[PDB]
């Protein structure tokens, strides 16, 4: 009947709109990877610009929420920008009301609670987006916390989201099982970027050019995104490795 | 515009509230959690089923603190439980502590959470909560108490029980194993035994969460100088303690 | 119920409006005739039992001393409309020290007709289920008779019948009306048309008459004068022989 | 404190004869012991052969004149261009003035 | 908040919710009202006669709106309570603003208007109640009896009945009521009322509840023994045939 | 599994689509052609106006709207929805200016419109916009051209086109981007826009059309949005008429 | 938009019934059995717990019998949460009447307040009705001992002895067979216990599956006694239902 | 102020109220009944600001009559006094409070006892054997403190009230044009024809 | 259709709003009216329709301001609502800015007012088409407004039943009536001919004909009754 249309329970105890939003999260057909370094945090995403009439500088799914928090979105760009604006407003309001910058996990929990409110109320529809917040929290160090359209959120040593998410996840798992540590033992953030790009090339099995990647880096008290030429330099360094 | 002002949970001709039963169904598919009341404390326990080993299971807590003497665990939908714990903390602070200067007793806090959930089952444009809650608390005039709250908004006091997938098999195990003279460590051991059945993967301090409402811990108060202020009764066990007690199973 | 209350049909009409028009079709009979000597309003009381005191059937109401109204259909709804009319009339006096024009009163009444729907100022759920014949006199447009429907539309009729016999009655009205019609002639004409379209034998207990004149204003005829007019029309029709059989 | 009222002087006069009326006013608009303008008329024709003047506070007088002209416009709109009776205009002006019974137009009005 | 249009028009020109409320009225206990030359009698039917029922506290079918107006109903009891409360409040308000008790016609019209508003408002269903309002105007000896239906229509009646089996009782009343000769005495009115009720209440006299209204606020409820006297007297005449 | 996911806005289908939004896009595709071209110092917008009859007053019935004094917007699809969206965008720009003094930057205005539309695709009580809007202008960071779809999705383009002949236009634009890496001039962009409108008119060649061109250039219009009129309009029309025939 | 999903909880059936009222009454019929009996010298309330488990702390459990004030108590049949909402509102109304008039609330006034609340839920708002039936037992100086009942329909009535919940037909038959106007409180207790034991869906009545309450006059002051587990077990073994 | 006096005698309550209402320097009326029958066994005399008095009195009367009709029962005098006190205490902190003082006299039939309550415009209620509002008490109380006796008869109470009225007419600056005297007992409310 | 024509908030799979089209059909099933302008005048000729022969002829031309008026075709109440809104807007212009509201801006306001109803749940599009004539600081203007929200300026047009005859007459007579500058009676005669080009089994009479004229040195005036006998 109509238990498939709004956020009410099916006889099996499931919410079909949540599942369909989850399915919609992959509409962009882009894979994103996130890893923690020794003192930084890197996020890589596929930049796919099909139309040449497009301004390639405007195509991005990574957002600078605050001076410290970055957020990469898997899902349509309307809901992506909606979540981005809401998260920026929440971070600013938190900074104003409580006197310090909003933590990564706190913003993630706030967005997950909002998604849960969408999960229980009828007039609000879920947002077909998966949100990965990354930062270097002053109390927790490198932090990666991810939320989904179900209101669920959790933190990772390293994570991946997208159509081929299982492959990248298994790759990272194997690497960490071999290293027996929960981070990329490297002092420079450029090397962690190179590690992430290398392992994404290994998992997805495709070569990238400078215009095929978005690279966000979060260091203590800063979150930025690399330009095309910095990504090209990282790809050159990767190609010159063994 | 929220035009959904009508009830989404109505009575069927068979005298059934469909959404309530469907929430109970969603609860039954949740991971098993359990609670056991002893003579000098209560114990709540559940399995920390992570999605991927890349995920840090400690960052997500199934056992949460409501008041320094009242904790809670759940079975069902994680996000509903999280927002319910937030609402419960806020209602315990506002609707009691800001009025009487003391934290609410277990029965009244459970009643408030039950009111919230019933409003979720009767108000307009909303579905019932897809969780079942086991709340273990301690107050001075009622002692220790363990309550269960269902999506229907009803709550019951249990000497010991469990909810989730392997609830029945767990509950039977508790009936043959429980008595009215158990000490706190006995309840902890029985909880670990009952949980070991309803778990499929590894069974260690990093895959299980367990909290106790036992003695007052003044070392966890953070300040000294007030003799009338003793430590909290709620304490989550560390993975080291869980594994130490597993080593003697 | 699968569509909205203010939904358009593929033909370009409002469903609830047409349904209320049908309800009006199922209503009692109300006929008005306007002449240079005044306007006459006659209604069928339609008492559903002999024990019902026929006096308590007030289907002709006074909006003001110069404006009278007859109702047809779900008469209950008309109550609210009548109030909105009466107050409005007196208010136009209070604000302007003069009588409100008949067309202005009718337009103000019609302004409520389409004030229905969902959303929300909250509006009523359904349109009115009653049609109105509003008769009056002002120094601008003389004697006037208006038909007001729950469609928000109002017309001005020299003579109009609404209700059950409203179709057949209307035809005979078109055949029996002229610009030189007098007041007594209009009274007897309303009586005759009512006697034709009424299922019951018309007497002074199941029919009610009223008239708006410039002199005496709006006056509702009592049972005795109405019965005398009924006897007069009986004598007129019984003593008429304009036939040519051979 | 801010004083919301002021006096611009002026004088108006109204006479009614057999088949005519006359409303006259001085064209001097002043403030305190200074002249603002020597020709600022305040006796206006509103239509329907109705002349009005609200003398006193210039702002309130202008506001009332504009409100009455708007009222006659809407009275023509809503009543089939019916001529506004002089007594009807007087009643409507009474209601306009009493609308601000507790913040009055500091003007003496004559039509 | 909730403004869903529940009472709307049907393609044939019918407001279904109103008719279904009338049907709910047809399922309620019977009530009857009769006008005399100087008194009004209201009779009501008791749901069979249960033994575990406490009759001292259960609300009666006849409720006073003021000292001089009474109200009987047929249909849903809760909607009747709502209408009775609104009517009593309006009676006190009319006393307060007019310094004169309300007329039966005015109270009847108020109740009818309330019901009509409930048939044309959003988010609400019409009243499943039909009402019989009886009494005497202040300082007036002329009896007053009115009826209102869920549709909002109100009308005066020499004698009327509402509820289940009201067709048979209305036929009996149309048969045994002479407008030229209304029951001159209170006894005649009560006898006609109890006879009309016994035409449908096959059970005993306990099922009959009679109240009599007389001018200057003279409202008295008849005892079960008086009802037994009336039923025995009418039955003995029937057997004579 | 099931049916009825397209009868209510904001309802996700089992595949993960908002069918009402795609129906609005289809409604857009039924509209006239409108294009935008970003040159080196500004942007030029052009639109076709289908002449339903000779009774229409020429040069009237303007289709391109202006926001603030530097933003131009042209919308293909349901004209009333585009007018409403332009009104909301003007309100957003007025708020931004009143609070921050500076005129609203083009990307900020784009994001404002996008959030408005995305909100309009969030509830079953509001219909998604039935128009695709090509807008832009010159701000402190140079020229910006954006296109916004009924889904709330918007992007920055070197050139954009929507409507019936969009594909035709989308072809010609792709030529220019390839043949002018250095960038077009404002006047040359106006001529190319006239040409592209004339070419895309063939997809709706049934009735005759009227060309409407506006532009916002840092040097030609000093950063202000102005309608191309008079001699420059006739030059662009003659250029297009010569290139097509 | 949202019109397709509205169940319209407050609409009439073609016969003239309230769908949700009847369905909630069915849900209540599927609930525990509660019996109230009024005697000449007191009133008794008895109720059967449908939740049956040996691991249920029956001591600190009160799911069927609740206190409104100190002179009025309620036996509930149906959804416990809606019941508790109505109980809180009823306590607040009683205390408001006390604060206003400085007199204890008459029973019928509270009963009619709750019934009007229920009806309001069965006429406007488009919300589901309360799936709860109440048995009120009270004492006021006007009518003395009083036993009332109310259902989701918003209708309320009075009784000498009445039952709500499951097996109400057989319970009413037994009560009507064994009731007398001159019974005492102990006779009423025995009758309620026997009716519950004969209309129970379990093996036999035990203390852990019972809630019991008595409102008495034993001095001139009324006592509202909620029975404890041991008191219930003792009255059970004394009436002969059990043995120990 | 106006003369508002009350005395509680064994099996009766007597209330006296000035008959004069004066606005400005002119006595507008000399036959004003400053009482309202709240119920057949409960009467209330009132005095205070012009307008507020009769408004509050008739409002209380309407509410009490509505309660009496709704329940077919008469509220005890204690309950009516508590209701009026709560109304006044809610009024005092409103935008425009009621400035009315009331004496409530009633024969409680369930206790078969007379009761008299005094409440000022603030909501301070007291049960007294005798009470007064305005300046009147400043004299009458003394007399009562000397002449009151619990086991008095209704006629003795009337004589004591006559003494109070004489003292007021002797030592009061205002001419209150006599008083209306009413008695509330088990048989209801009556008005002394000649005082 | 059946699953997409219940609300104005539901798009058809082809991208159509059916309620809007149903309102347009409600317009098409109304009395015929025609408007035509030159460079100095603007005329509305309306054929009022009656229920029967005992009924009046419902008014079709409404005055909005001393320089601007409109003619209706379809639902009379929606026409009254829109005309009252337009009166309010012209009045606000004159009072706040001492300015006559431009016809183009009036059309914009009406278009936005309709678009408000064609996108929100719990509301219907208006059920009337409008023809607006007005003389402003830019000369004479004629606008055609449909409740879809589309308003267009034309030298001449017509709406109602069989409006195509009048439209084609104007299409041919364009070069002729656009030159009727400074002659009101000739423009009125041209409008009467245009509306006669849309008659089937009927003749124009003083009872069914309404004229409206606005222009330079000519306030928006309405002619009914004997005043139209000079054109019959």
UniProtKB/Swiss-Prot annotation, chain A:
One biological process term in Gene Ontology: proteasome-mediated ubiquitin-dependent protein catabolic process
Something else known: Present with 15200 molecules/cell in log phase SD medium.
Gene source species: Saccharomyces cerevisiae (strain ATCC 204508 / S288c) (Baker's yeast)
UniProt crosslink position (Glycyl lysine isopeptide (Lys-Gly) (interchain with G-Cter in ubiquitin)): 222
Assembly and interaction partners: The 26S proteasome consists of a 20S proteasome core and two 19S regulatory subunits. The 20S proteasome core is composed of 28 subunits that are arranged in four stacked rings, resulting in a barrel-shaped structure. The two end rings are each formed by seven alpha subunits, and the two central rings are each formed by seven beta subunits. The catalytic chamber with the active sites is on the inside of the barrel. Interacts with CIC1.
Keyword Phosphoprotein carried by entry: yes
Name of encoding gene: SCL1
Described purpose of this protein according to its UniProt entry: The proteasome degrades poly-ubiquitinated proteins in the cytoplasm and in the nucleus. It is essential for the regulated turnover of proteins and for the removal of misfolded proteins. The proteasome is a multicatalytic proteinase complex that is characterized by its ability to cleave peptides with Arg, Phe, Tyr, Leu, and Glu adjacent to the leaving group at neutral or slightly basic pH. It has an ATP-dependent proteolytic activity.
Name listed for the protein in its UniProt record: Proteasome subunit alpha type-1
Claim: 4Fe-4S is one of the keywords in the record: no
Places the protein is found: Cytoplasm; Nucleus
Keywords: Acetylation, Cytoplasm, Isopeptide bond, Nucleus, Phosphoprotein, Proteasome, Ubl conjugation
Residues found modified as Phosphoserine: 227
One GO CC term, this protein: nucleus
Coiled-coil blocks: none
Major subcellular site: cytoplasm
UniProtKB/Swiss-Prot annotation, chain B:
UniProt source species: Saccharomyces cerevisiae (strain ATCC 204508 / S288c) (Baker's yeast)
Function: The proteasome degrades poly-ubiquitinated proteins in the cytoplasm and in the nucleus. It is essential for the regulated turnover of proteins and for the removal of misfolded proteins. The proteasome is a multicatalytic proteinase complex that is characterized by its ability to cleave peptides with Arg, Phe, Tyr, Leu, and Glu adjacent to the leaving group at neutral or slightly basic pH. It has an ATP-dependent proteolytic activity.
Matches recorded under SMART domains: Proteasome_A_N
GO cellular component: nucleus; proteasome complex; proteasome core complex, alpha-subunit complex; proteasome storage granule
PROSITE patterns from the UniProt entry: PROTEASOME_ALPHA_1, PROTEASOME_ALPHA_2
Cited PANTHER family: PROTEASOME SUBUNIT ALPHA/BETA (PTHR11599)
Additional facts recorded: Present with 7060 molecules/cell in log phase SD medium.
InterPro entries cross-referenced by the UniProt entry: Ntn_hydrolases_N, Proteasome_alpha, Proteasome_alpha-type, Proteasome_asu_N, Proteasome_sua/b
Listed name of the protein: Proteasome subunit alpha type-2
Record family assignment: Belongs to the peptidase T1A family.
Keywords: Cytoplasm, Isopeptide bond, Nucleus, Proteasome, Ubl conjugation
SUPFAM superfamilies, per the entry: N-terminal nucleophile aminohydrolases (Ntn hydrolases) (SSF56235)
Superkingdom, taxonomy of origin: Eukaryota
Residue location of crosslink Glycyl lysine isopeptide (Lys-Gly) (interchain with G-Cter in ubiquitin): 107
Location in or out of the cell: Cytoplasm; Nucleus
Pfam families: Proteasome, Proteasome_A_N
GO biological process: proteasomal ubiquitin-independent protein catabolic process; proteasome-mediated ubiquitin-dependent protein catabolic process
Swiss-Prot record, chain D:
GO cellular-component term (any): proteasome core complex, beta-subunit complex
Keywords: Cytoplasm, Nucleus, Proteasome
Compartments, as annotated in UniProt: Cytoplasm; Nucleus
GO terms classed as biological process: proteasomal ubiquitin-independent protein catabolic process; proteasome-mediated ubiquitin-dependent protein catabolic process
Principal localisation: cytoplasm
Similarity comment: Belongs to the peptidase T1B family.
Record function comment: Non-catalytic component of the proteasome which degrades poly-ubiquitinated proteins in the cytoplasm and in the nucleus. It is essential for the regulated turnover of proteins and for the removal of misfolded proteins. The proteasome is a multicatalytic proteinase complex that is characterized by its ability to cleave peptides with Arg, Phe, Tyr, Leu, and Glu adjacent to the leaving group at neutral or slightly basic pH. It has an ATP-dependent proteolytic activity.
Subunit-structure text: The 26S proteasome consists of a 20S proteasome core and two 19S regulatory subunits. The 20S proteasome core is composed of 28 subunits that are arranged in four stacked rings, resulting in a barrel-shaped structure. The two end rings are each formed by seven alpha subunits, and the two central rings are each formed by seven beta subunits. The catalytic chamber with the active sites is on the inside of the barrel.
Annotated protein name in UniProt: Proteasome subunit beta type-6
Organism encoding this protein: Saccharomyces cerevisiae (strain ATCC 204508 / S288c)
UniProtKB/Swiss-Prot annotation, chain I:
Keyword Transit peptide included in the entry's annotation: no
Major subcellular location class: cytoplasm
InterPro entries the UniProt entry points to: Ntn_hydrolases_N (IPR029055), Proteasome_alpha (IPR050115), Proteasome_alpha-type (IPR023332), Proteasome_asu_N (IPR000426), Proteasome_sua/b (IPR001353)
UniProt cross-references to Pfam families, sorted A to Z: Proteasome, Proteasome_A_N
Keywords: Cytoplasm, Isopeptide bond, Nucleus, Phosphoprotein, Proteasome, Ubl conjugation
Sites of the Glycyl lysine isopeptide (Lys-Gly) (interchain with G-Cter in ubiquitin) crosslink: 189
Compartment(s) of residence: Cytoplasm; Nucleus
An example Gene Ontology CC term for this record: nucleus
SUPFAM superfamilies: N-terminal nucleophile aminohydrolases (Ntn hydrolases)
Note: Present with 7210 molecules/cell in log phase SD medium.
Family of this protein: Belongs to the peptidase T1A family.
Listed name of the protein: Proteasome subunit alpha type-6
Organism: Saccharomyces cerevisiae (strain ATCC 204508 / S288c)
């Amino acid at each position: 009947g109509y238990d498939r249309h709004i956020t009410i329970f099916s006889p099996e105890g499931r919410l079909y709109q949540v599942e369909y939003a989850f399915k919609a999260t992959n509409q962009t057909n882009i894979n994103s990877l996130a890893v923690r370094g020794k003192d930084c945090t890197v996020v890589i995403s596929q930049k796919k610009v099909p139309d040449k009439l497009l301004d390639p500088t405007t195509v991005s799914y990574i957002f600078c929420i605050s001076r410290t928090i970055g957020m990469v979105v898997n899902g349509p760009i309307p809901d992506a920008r909606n979540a981005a604006l809401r998260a920026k407003a929440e971070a600013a309001e938190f900074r104003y009301k409580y006197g310090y910058d909003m933590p990564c996990d706190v913003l993630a929990k706030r967005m997950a609670n909002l998604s849960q409110i969408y999960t229980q109320r009828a007039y609000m529809r879920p947002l077909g987006v998966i949100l990965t917040f990354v930062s270097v929290d002053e109390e927790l160090g490198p932090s990666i916390y991810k939320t989904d359209p179900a209101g669920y959120y959790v933190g990772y040593k390293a994570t991946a989201t997208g159509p081929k998410q299982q492959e990248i996840t298994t790759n990272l798992e194997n690497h960490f099982k071999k290293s027996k540590i929960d981070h990329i033992n490297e002092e420079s953030w450029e090397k962690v970027v190179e590690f992430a790009i290398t392992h994404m090339i290994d998992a997805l099995g495709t070569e990238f050019s400078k215009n095929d990647l978005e690279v966000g880096v979060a260091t203590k008290d800063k979150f930025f995104t690399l330009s095309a030429e910095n990504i090209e330099e990282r790809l050159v360094a990767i190609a010159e490795q063994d | 515009t929220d035009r959904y002002s009508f009830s989404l949970t109505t009575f069927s001709p068979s005298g059934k509230l469909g959404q309530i039963d469907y929430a109970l169904t969603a609860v039954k598919q949740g991971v098993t959690s359990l609670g056991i009341k002893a003579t000098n404390g209560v114990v709540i326990a559940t399995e920390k089923k992570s999605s991927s080993p890349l995920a840090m299971s400690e960052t997500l807590s199934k056992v949460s603190l409501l008041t320094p003497d009242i904790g809670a665990v759940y079975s069902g939908m994680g996000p509903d439980y999280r927002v319910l714990v937030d609402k419960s903390r806020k209602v315990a602070h506002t609707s009691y502590k800001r009025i009487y200067g003391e934290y609410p007793p277990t029965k009244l806090l459970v009643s408030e959470v039950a009111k919230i959930m019933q409003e979720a089952t009767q108000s307009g444009g909303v579905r019932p909560f897809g969780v079942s809650l086991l709340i273990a608390g301690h107050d001075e005039f009622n002692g220790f108490s363990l309550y269960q709250v269902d999506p229907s908004g009803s709550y019951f006091p249990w000497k010991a029980t469990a909810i989730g997938k392997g609830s029945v098999a767990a509950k039977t195990f508790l009936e043959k194993r429980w008595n009215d003279e158990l000490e706190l460590e006995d309840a902890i051991h029985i909880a670990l035994l009952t949980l070991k059945e309803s778990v499929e993967g590894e069974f260690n301090g990093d895959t299980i969460e367990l909290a106790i409402i036992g003695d007052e811990n003044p070392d966890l108060l953070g300040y000294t100088g007030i003799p009338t202020d003793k430590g909290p009764r709620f304490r989550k066990l560390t993975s080291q303690e869980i594994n130490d007690r597993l080593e003697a199973l | 119920y699968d569509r909205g209350v203010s939904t358009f049909s593929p033909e370009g009409r409002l469903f609830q409006v047409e349904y209320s028009l049908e309800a009006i079709k199922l209503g009692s009979t109300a006929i008005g005739i306007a002449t240079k000597e005044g306007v006459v309003l006659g209604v069928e009381k339609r008492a559903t039992s002999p024990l019902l005191e026929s006096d308590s059937i007030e289907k002709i109401v006074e909006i003001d001393r110069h404006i009278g109204c007859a109702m047809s259909g779900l008469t209950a709804d008309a109550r609210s409309m009548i109030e909105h009319a009466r107050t409005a009339a007196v208010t136009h006096n209070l604000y302007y020290d003069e009588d409100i024009n008949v067309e202005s009163l009718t337009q103000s009444v019609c302004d409520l007709a389409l004030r229905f729907g969902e959303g929300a100022e909250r509006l009523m759920s359904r349109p009115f289920g009653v049609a109105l014949l509003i008769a009056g006199h002002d120094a601008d447009d003389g004697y006037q008779l208006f038909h007001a429907e729950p469609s928000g539309t109002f017309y001005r009729y020299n003579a109009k019948a609404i209700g059950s016999g409203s179709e057949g009655a209307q035809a005979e009205l078109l055949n029996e009306w002229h610009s030189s019609l007098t007041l007594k002639e209009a009274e007897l004409l309303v009586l005759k048309i009512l006697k034709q379209v009424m299922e019951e034998k018309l007497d002074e207990n199941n029919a009610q008459l009223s008239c708006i004149t410039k002199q005496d204003g709006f006056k509702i005829y009592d049972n005795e004068k109405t019965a005398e007019l009924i006897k007069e029309l009986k004598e007129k029709e019984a003593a008429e022989s304009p036939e040519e059989a051979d | 404190q801010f004083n919301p009222y002021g006096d611009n002087g002026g004088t108006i006069l109204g006479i009614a004869g057999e088949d005519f009326a006359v409303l006259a006013g001085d064209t001097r608009n002043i403030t305190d012991y200074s002249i603002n303008s020597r020709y600022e008329p305040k006796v206006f024709d509103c239509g329907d052969n109705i002349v009005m003047s609200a003398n006193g506070f210039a702002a309130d007088g202008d506001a009332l004149v504009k409100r009455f002209k708007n009222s006659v416009k809407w009275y023509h709109f809503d009543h089939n261009d019916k001529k506004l009776s002089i007594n009807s205009a007087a009643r409507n002006i009474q209601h306009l003035l009493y609308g601000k019974r507790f913040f009055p137009y500091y003007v003496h009005t004559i039509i | 908040g909730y403004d869903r249009a529940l009472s709307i028009f049907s393609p044939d020109g019918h407001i279904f919710q109103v008719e279904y409320a009338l049907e709910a009225v047809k399922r309620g206990t019977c009530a009857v009202g009769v006008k005399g030359k100087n008194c009004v009698v209201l009779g009501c039917e008791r749901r069979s006669t249960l033994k575990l029922q406490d009759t001292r506290i259960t609300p009666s079918k006849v409720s006073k709106i003021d000292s001089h107006v009474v109200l009987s109903f047929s249909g849903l009891n809760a909607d009747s309570r709502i209408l009775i409360e609104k009517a009593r409040v309006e009676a006190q308000s009319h006393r307060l603003t007019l310094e004169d008790p309300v007329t039966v016609e005015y109270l009847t019209r108020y109740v009818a208007g309330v019901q009509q508003r409930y048939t044309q408002s959003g988010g609400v269903r019409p009243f499943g109640v039909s009402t019989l309002i009886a009494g005497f105007d202040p300082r007036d000896d002329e009896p007053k009896l009115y009826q209102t239906e869920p549709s909002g229509i109100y009308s005066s009646w020499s004698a009327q009945t509402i509820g289940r089996n009201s067709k048979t009782v209305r036929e009996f009343l149309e048969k045994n009521y002479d407008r030229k000769e209304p029951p001159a005495t209170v006894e005649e009115c009560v006898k006609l009322t109890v006879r009309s009720l016994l035409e449908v209440v096959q059970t005993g006299a306990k099922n009959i509840e009679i109240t009599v209204v007389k001018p200057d606020s003279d409202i008295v409820a008849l005892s079960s023994e008086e009802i037994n006297q009336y039923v025995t007297q009418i039955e003995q005449e029937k057997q004579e045939q | 599994i099931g049916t009825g996911y397209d009868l209510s806005n904001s309802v996700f289908s089992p595949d993960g689509r908002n069918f009402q939004v795609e129906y609005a896009v289809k409604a857009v595709e039924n509209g006239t052609t409108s294009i935008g071209i970003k040159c080196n110092d500004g942007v030029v917008f052009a639109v076709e106006k289908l002449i339903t009859s000779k009774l229409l007053v020429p040069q009237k019935n303007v289709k391109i709207q202006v926001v603030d004094r530097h933003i131009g917007c042209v919308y293909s699809g349901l004209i009333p929805d585009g007018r409403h969206l332009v009104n909301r965008g003007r309100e957003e720009a007025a708020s931004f200016k009143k609070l921050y003094k500076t005129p609203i930057p083009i990307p900020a205005f784009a994001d404002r419109l996008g959030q408005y539309v995305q909100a309009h695709t969030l509830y079953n009580s509001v219909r998604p916009f039935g128009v695709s809007t090509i807008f832009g202008g010159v701000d402190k960071n140079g020229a910006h051209l954006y296109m916004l779809e009924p889904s709330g999705s918007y992007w920055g383009y070197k050139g954009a086109a929507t409507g019936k002949g969009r594909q035709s236009a989308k072809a010609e634009l792709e030529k220019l981007v390839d043949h002018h890496p250095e960038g077009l001039s404002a006047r040359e962009a106006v001529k190319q826009a006239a040409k592209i409108i004339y070419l895309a008119h063939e997809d709706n060649k049934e009735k005759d059309f009227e060309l409407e061109i506006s532009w916002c250039s840092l040097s030609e219009t000093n950063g202000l949005h102005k309608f191309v009129k008079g001699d420059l309009l006739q030059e662009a029309i003659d250029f297009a008429q010569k290139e097509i025939n | 938009g949202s019109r397709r999903y509205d169940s319209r909880t407050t609409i009439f059936s073609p016969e003239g019934r309230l769908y949700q009222v009847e369905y909630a009454l069915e849900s209540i019929s599927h609930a525990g059995t509660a019996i109230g009996i009024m005697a000449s010298d007191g009133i008794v309330l008895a109720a059967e717990r449908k939740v049956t488990s040996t691991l249920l702390e029956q001591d600190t459990s009160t799911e069927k019998l609740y206190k409104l004030n100190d002179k009025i108590a309620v036996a509930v049949a149906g959804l416990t949460a809606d019941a508790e909402i109505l109980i809180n509102t009823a306590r607040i109304h009683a205390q408001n009447y006390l604060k206003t008039y400085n007199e204890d609330i008459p029973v019928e006034i509270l009963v009619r307040r709750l019934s009007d609340i229920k009806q309001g839920y069965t006429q406007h708002g488009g919300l589901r009705p309360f799936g709860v039936s109440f048995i009120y037992a009270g004492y006021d100086d006007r009518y003395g001992y009083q036993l009332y009942t109310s259902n989701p329909s918003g209708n309320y009535t009075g009784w000498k002895a009445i039952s709500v919940g499951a097996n109400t037909s057989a319970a009413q038959t037994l009560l009507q067979m064994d009731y007398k106007d001159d019974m005492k409180v102990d006779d009423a207790i025995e009758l309620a216990l026997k009716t519950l034991s004969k209309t129970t869906d379990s093996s036999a009545l035990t203390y852990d599956r019972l809630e019991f309450a008595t409102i008495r006059k034993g001095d001139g002051e009324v006592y509202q006694k909620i029975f404890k587990p041991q008191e219930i077990k003792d009255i059970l073994v004394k009436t002969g239902i059990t043995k120990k | 102020m106006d003369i508002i006096l009350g005395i509680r005698v064994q099996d009766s309550v007597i209330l006296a109220s000035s008959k004069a209402v004066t606005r400005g320097i002119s006595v507008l009326k000399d036959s004003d009944d400053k009482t309202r029958q709240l119920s057949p066994h409960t009467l209330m005399s009132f005095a205070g600001e012009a307008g507020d008095t009769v408004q509050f009195a008739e409002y209380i009367q309407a509410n009490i009559q509505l309660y009496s009709i709704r329940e077919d029962y008469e509220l005890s005098p204690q309950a009516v006094s508590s209701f009026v006190r709560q109304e006044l205490a809610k009024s005092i902190r409103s935008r425009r409070p009621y400035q009315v003082n009331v004496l409530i006299g009633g024969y409680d039939k369930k206790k078969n006892k007379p009761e008299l309550y005094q409440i000022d415009y603030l909501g301070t209620k007291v049960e007294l054997p005798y009470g007064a509002h305005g300046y009147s008490g400043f004299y009458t109380f003394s007399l009562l403190d000397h002449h009151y006796r619990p086991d008095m008869t209704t006629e003795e109470g009337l004589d004591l009230l006559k003494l109070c009225v004489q003292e007021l007419e002797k030592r009061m600056p205002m001419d209150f044009k006599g008083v209306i005297v009413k008695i509330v007992d088990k048989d209801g409310i009556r008005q002394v024809d000649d005082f | 259709r059946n699953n997409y024509d219940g609300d104005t908030v539901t798009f058809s799979p082809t991208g159509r709003l059916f309620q809007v089209e149903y309102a347009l059909e409600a317009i098409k099933q109304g009395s015929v009216t025609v408007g035509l302008r030159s460079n100095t005048h603007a005329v509305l000729v309306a054929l009022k329709r009656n229920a029967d022969e005992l009924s009046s002829y419902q008014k079709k031309i409404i005055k909005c301001d001393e320089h601007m008026g409109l003619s209706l075709a379809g639902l009379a109440p929606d026409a009254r609502v829109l005309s009252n809104y337009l009166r309010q807007q012209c009045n606000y212009s004159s009072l706040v800015f001492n300015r006559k509201l431009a016809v183009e801006r009036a059309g914009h306001l009406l278009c936005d007012k309709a678009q408000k109803n064609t996108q929100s749940y719990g509301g219907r599009p208006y059920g009337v088409g409008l023809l607006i004539i007005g003389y402003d600081k830019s000369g004479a203007h004629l606008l055609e407004f449909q409740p879809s929200g589309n308003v267009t300026e034309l030298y001449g047009t017509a709406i109602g039943a069989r409006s195509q005859g009048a439209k084609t007459y104007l299409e041919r007579t364009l070069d002729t009536f656009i030159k009727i500058d400074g002659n009101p009676d000739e423009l009125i005669k041209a409008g009467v001919e245009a509306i006669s080009q849309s008659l089937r089994d009927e003749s124009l009479t003083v009872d069914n004909l309404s004229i409206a004229i606005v222009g330079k040195d000519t306030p928006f005036t309405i002619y009914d009754g004997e005043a139209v006998a000079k054109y019959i």
